Amino acid sequence: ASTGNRRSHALNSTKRRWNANLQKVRILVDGKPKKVWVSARALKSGKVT
RNA sequence: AGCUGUAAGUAAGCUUUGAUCCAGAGAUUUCCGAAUGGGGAAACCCAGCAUGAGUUAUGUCAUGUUAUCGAUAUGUGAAUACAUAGCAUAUCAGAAGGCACACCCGGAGAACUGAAACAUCUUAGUACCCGGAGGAAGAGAAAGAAAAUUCGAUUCCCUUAGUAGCGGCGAGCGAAAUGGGAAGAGCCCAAACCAACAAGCUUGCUUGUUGGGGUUGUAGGACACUCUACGGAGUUACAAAGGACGACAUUAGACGAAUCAUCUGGAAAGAUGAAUCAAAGAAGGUAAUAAUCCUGUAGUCGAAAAUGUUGUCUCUCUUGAGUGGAUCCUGAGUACGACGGAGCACGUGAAAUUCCGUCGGAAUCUGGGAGGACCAUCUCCUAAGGCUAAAUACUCUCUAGUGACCGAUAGUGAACCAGUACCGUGAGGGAAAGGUGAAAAGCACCCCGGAAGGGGAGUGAAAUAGAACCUGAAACCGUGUGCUUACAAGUAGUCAGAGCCCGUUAAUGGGUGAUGGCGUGCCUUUUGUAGAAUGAACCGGCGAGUUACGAUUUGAUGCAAGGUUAAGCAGUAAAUGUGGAGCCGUAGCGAAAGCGAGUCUGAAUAGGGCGUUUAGUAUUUGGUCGUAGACCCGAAACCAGGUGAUCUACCCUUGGUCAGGUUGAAGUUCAGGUAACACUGAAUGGAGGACCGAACCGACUUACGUUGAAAAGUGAGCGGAUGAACUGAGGGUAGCGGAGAAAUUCCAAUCGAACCUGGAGAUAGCUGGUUCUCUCCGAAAUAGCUUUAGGGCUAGCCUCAAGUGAU
RNA sequence: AUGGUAGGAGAGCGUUCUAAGGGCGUUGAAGCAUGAUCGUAAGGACAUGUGGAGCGCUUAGAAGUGAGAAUGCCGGUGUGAGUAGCGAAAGACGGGUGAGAAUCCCGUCCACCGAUUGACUAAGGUUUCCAGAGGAAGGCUCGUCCGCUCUGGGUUAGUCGGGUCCUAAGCUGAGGCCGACAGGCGUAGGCGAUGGAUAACAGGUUGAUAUUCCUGUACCACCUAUAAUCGUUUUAAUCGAU
RNA sequence: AGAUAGAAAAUAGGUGCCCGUACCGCAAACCGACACAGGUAGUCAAGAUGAGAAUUCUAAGGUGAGCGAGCGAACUCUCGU
RNA sequence: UAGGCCCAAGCGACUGUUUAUCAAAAACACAGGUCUCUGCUAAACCGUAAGGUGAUGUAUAGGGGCUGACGCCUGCCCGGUGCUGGAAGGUUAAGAGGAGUGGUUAGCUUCUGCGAAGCUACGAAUCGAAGCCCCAGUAAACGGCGGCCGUAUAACGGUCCUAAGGUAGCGAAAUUCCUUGUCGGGUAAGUUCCGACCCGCACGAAAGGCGUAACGAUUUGGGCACUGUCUCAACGAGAGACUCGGUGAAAUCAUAGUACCUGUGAAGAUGCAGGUUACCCGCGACAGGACGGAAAGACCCCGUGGAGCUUUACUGUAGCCUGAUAUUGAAAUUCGGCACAGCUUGUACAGGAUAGGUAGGAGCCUUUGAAACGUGAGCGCUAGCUUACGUGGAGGCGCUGGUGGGAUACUACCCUAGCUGUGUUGGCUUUCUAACCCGCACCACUUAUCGUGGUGGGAGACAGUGUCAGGCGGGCAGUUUGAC
RNA sequence: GGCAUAAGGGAGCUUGACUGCGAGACCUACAAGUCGAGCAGGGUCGAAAGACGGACUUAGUGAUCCGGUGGUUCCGCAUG
Ligand SMILES: CC[C@H]1OC(=O)[C@H](C)[C@@H](O[C@@H]2C[C@@](C)(OC)[C@@H](O)[C@H](C)O2)[C@H](C)[C@@H](O[C@@H]2O[C@H](C)C[C@H](N(C)C)[C@H]2O)[C@@](C)(O)C[C@@H](C)C(=O)[C@H](C)[C@@H](O)[C@@]1(C)O
């Protein structure tokens, strides 16, 4: 998903995205240590490096 | 017992050994198209490998095979020593990719429009862009909702109610609680236990693995207490009986009713006389209208995959073993919240569900935790930790079988040659034309000009019934005959009369055609029109008032102390019957609590407002409003998805072309004046967005063309003509864009923003139209206000209907 | 005593069916189109044509109901004129053929284009090419030609032009990068002529093809036999790079 | 390099696939609704005259124009005095 | 078949380009100027991004703006706006801190507020960067270069206001209203033309001024040649006119046999209604009707009908700057928390015997020592004030009493501080590397510079990216532009 | 338009610059706009009858949202 509005003071609307905070890091996927994008929230408590 | 599709007639065969047909099963199935050997401008070109045939051999041909990620076993394994990747294999090719985008779930998501734009809001989470599955999903056996005394594991589809609420409190949007149909079907990780394995470890333990155990607690288990199992049995699921599993349908289907004869035009199916046999007896199609020719309807037997699918249905179930909840377990970046937003009827906020980014950080029996602002009581969970049921959606046309229906400007654009002629570069747009049979019997035969006629001829119950056998009509228009009719000034008619006729569906009938008076449309729009205001020959598909469904005002009644049905169910797609989990009147008043023939106001019980002093609807059914898009036709334009650089503008790569003349740059070199060669005379040389001028390229004047030869041309002159020249082939840039020596110029005869489809019947306070009836009688026409003023609303002037009744 | 584009309550007709009743009808029954009736209607009961098998009346109900214009649409039809025009250029006569000739064929003379109105090759078009025979239409006539019919047909390559070669601009592109999706970009590599590479000329011959067919003379490749020659197969003229 | 013996050559034999090919083609056959005075890349191009591919006439080769044709004012258009 | 020429002015240097289809020009280009941006993964531009152009370039280069060969030149104003820079003056949002306050509660009297412990809604003392404000510069940046009375800053005087009021050269001009201005030349006659004047409505110096050889299908004036252009006819061909034809269309479909004469219709007249004239029908020769059309007027209105374009119209936004946070680490320096607890003087007419900027302070310290005397902190104009005391000993004081203009008993506590180390908390600036990032170099996969890995180098907790905040934002959008 | 019934100056004060209605009150499309009696119900001036619900009369201004006060009569997230 992750679209929605930007709203003005007179309450106009323009469509707009919210992007995740992807950072490129080297994780240990199956086999090699590989570089990949993953969000900062996801490596808060999800996945080893 | 005939047959050789449509798209007809021979040779023909079949063949009683059963043709042609009709069902079922198989076999063959070129080439292209995810196309997948490689390539490509689909339907073509070019290969390899392995067999095989051929060949003295090649060449040639035939048959197989050769496009990425998963699984089995692996193997090798550069920068860098092994490893593992990767890698190259061998196999199943496994599996991707096939969609009526009608229903469904997701992602992303306009706009014209409404408000008398709108920008909040609405249109609308709509179009249709993309992705999924599919005969669904979601949900779910609950931090589940319900808030009375709860409740229905759920769950999903037809009452409350246009209510509560939301809302530039505008336009508008718009619930749920309290139930019918259908109906439950329960699984995990967690706790400890146990048994093996290995590893660490020092064989103790721990780690982990495999398995039984258990999924809700005002407790489940180790336990701790205590003593039962195939009792029931069960397949849509966890044990399946997979079973002989006991009817798929009794489905292909096919056989299989029963009547009828006579007289007058072809025949009876008009008048006589008869009949039909029971589950059919019922409709409906055939030179004549057979509930009794084709046939069904009834009956019959019924075969492949069938087996109603069951009442033992092998295996095999699960008889539950009762107390406590005391200690452990009950799910992690999480409950849990800030900040931006979205969805919830609700305009984000005082928010109970979701997204991004950041925070962080619980608890355990003295459990904790959760529920449209906080603390105590009620319901819930043992959320997040997880799941998965059926009944529950929906029909291109699938398939078959059927109807105040399409009756063929038709359900269809197309019941015929139809997505075809044709049009467009392409996306795309898109017609016209339909119609024996009684039987071709289609004019043998025969006679005069090719076509076409005139005769006979005919199957011809009837060819002015001749290829226009669907016949077949009209009108416009015709054209050839004739009866009457010829000094004039014309809304062509009408009211006043010599010649010629003569009468049906019958009686001042039926007329026909000559003279003096008088003389303006469907029409529309107007103060006013007949045009010098608009628009117009004939015919016609053929061309301008439903309901979802509401509101309000004008017949009959259950039937009036009174109101039930909506859905549902049973019935032939009817009537009808049934239907209280269910829905207007009999009472009003107040903002409300509340009171009640009254009540509000008032601190009053006061006045005064609004009521009382009977009539409604289960009602159902005949004019006007509302929502629909709403009497019809017509914009300029907006948005979304696509198609276009074969024209033209730039550019890229690679090619080509330019008669002939003239001038004579830089440079060189000799010599008149020549001597400190030196200036300037001559030879040479061949430069240039040089000059004149053909081909080629342009387009300044003019004439001609202007229903042109031509949707930009011809004649005569004219500018450029070795360059910032001209030109071919193949490429590239695309519309919220491109290109532009710049003109609002060009992007397929189009451009202050192309073309096609769609939203889309956009919107149109403006213009035009608005018909077969005829009613009869009856109203006419200004003040006031106006995000808006040639429009609108209320009053006036109204018709119609009731009423009081001197007004 | 008795008008009104806006007004209310009115009696009626074309299509259809119920829902009926009752009729006209295969010695004929239509309807429809031409007939004296009904009439304000709309709408129906007896002489030609039609056919040749379909309709009315009565009562009631339902409306693809409801027919002069909208610069309306068209199955569409047909008018309004012997008018405008017939699209640049030189023809004349004789013969022939024929149902019929300013037109077709043959002849002679004359004329026009001549850096082209000539001759080749591309693109493009796709049977128009060539013979016969009728052209019902076609052609700004006729047929007594082709651009309708029948076939009789008719297109021949080692060397010509393309593919089994090479690459440019571009276009695609395994792995890779990016991106709500769809998708965009891009590496080796592929594809891609307008360029590079590559072997044939003279004569004869048909109604219709020709560097293709035939005749002569050549040239270029590939394969198999044929022989002397090079003879560590390293090297060696040969092989020969990845 | 490397690799094999090892060649080739010159003769004699065989063998040589696929696609195009007709016709129009600066036009009656292409693009232009048309048998339309337009547009359409390249090659060849004889004699006289001339500098010339200019001009005028002509060879070769093509064609008599393509349905329209026969008679004889105003006016209009092209042309000459 | 094959250039007409000469004299004179405008504009533009030139060849070139342009509105396919009414404009070829004086408009565009141009070679030259000049300004400005940009140190290389350049700026600029396209794209959501990746990629890419610039450029296989590197300040003698590249992008943007204005001017437009050449020659002589290019004056004044930096107040206003824009751009640049600086001092940094002040001001702030998201944020961090936590002084304090409400809301609940056994909590406390139980007729009642230490809100205590905790839970909750707040909250200021603050700090916090851009922008904004200020100051300087810049006019081949945007712009401006005068009113006023004297009088057509014309003369020169006055002002006015911010900043200045037009230098050269031109000048009735492609610019002049009055206006055909006036005078001369050219002609018989000159509104144009040329020369001259200056009273420049309203010329003027890179939206350049003045001049200029050559060039022009440019504009404009005069002359010669020459002519049917004109004063002011014949001939030739084609169309037309007569005949034939394979021939045979088109543009209005009230409809109606359709004179010259009225009044007047929705007033210039068929049918709308007094007189005059006219026998029926054709063929060759033009405009009243149709106020023709194949044209539903192209400068009012509708109707918040459309559309394009502009801006200091309203509302937004692509984007751009700047913060805060996440990715996101380590040590040290400087100092906020513990910096503890912190001390004193300088000089002063005035306490009391003359002290520290100073605050709450009519009040504490007060056997937890208060003032002179041997003497002690720092220091002196030797008065002796603040402080710890044994020989002595109850006071010095203090905001106030103040020759005073403030003030030191308790207490921040001190600039004048210097500082010993302290559990540990949080700023600032450096410096490190492991995050992360190099269109970064060499080396292998490789076939391959894309990419992946190795090694060395650069850079570095920044940048980049995500979320939030704030400023700017006709670059782009939707609208409105009241209404009479 | 009125006005000497003052419709100008003094006293006391005051405070009628009153609370609820309105028996019974005109204009007007609508919405809106224009005076007395009764006592809930209490005053001021007057010796008293009485007069007084602003001024000689007629101009001197406004639904939705928001703020504040007061009653007091609603609400419930499960119940309080
Ligand atoms: C060749 C023939 C062309 O007509 C012309 O060029 C003549 C020469 C025009 O003159 C015009 C003149 C010029 C300026 O137009 C005014 C221009 O518009 C066009 C190009 O040509 C005429 C006469 C114009 O009439 C007049 O138009 C005026 C608006 C009003 C005038 N009258 C009512 C008062 C009216 O008669 C009007 C517009 O063109 C004719 C319209 C209907 C057309 O479109 C006609 C069919 C053209 O297409 C036609 C083929 O092209």
Q: Span between N and C termini?
A: 28 Å
Strand order of the largest sheet: 1-2
Tally of separate helices: 1
> Would you list the SSEs in sequence order as H and E?
EEEEH
What Rg do the Cα atoms give? 17 Å
Total count of domains: 1
Global outline: rod-shaped
DSSP E strands, number: 4
How much of the sequence lies in strands comes to: over 45%
- What would you call the structural class? mainly beta
- List all distinct small molecules, including ions and cofactors, that are bound in this structure: erythromycin A
- Main pleated sheet: 2 strands, antiparallel
Keywords: Ribonucleoprotein, Ribosomal protein
Protein name: Large ribosomal subunit protein bL28
Organism: Staphylococcus schweitzeri
Family: Belongs to the bacterial ribosomal protein bL28 family.
Task: Tell me about this structure.
This is Large ribosomal subunit protein bL28. The structure is cut from a larger assembly and holds one chain. It is built from 1 helix and 4 strands, in the order ββββα. It is mainly β and 49 residues long. The chain has one domain. The strands form 2 sheets. The chain has a two-stranded antiparallel ribbon. Strand 3 and strand 4 form a beta hairpin. The longest helix has 4 residues. The chain is rod-shaped and about 55 Å long. It binds 5 RNA strands through strand 1, strand 2, strand 3 and helix 1.
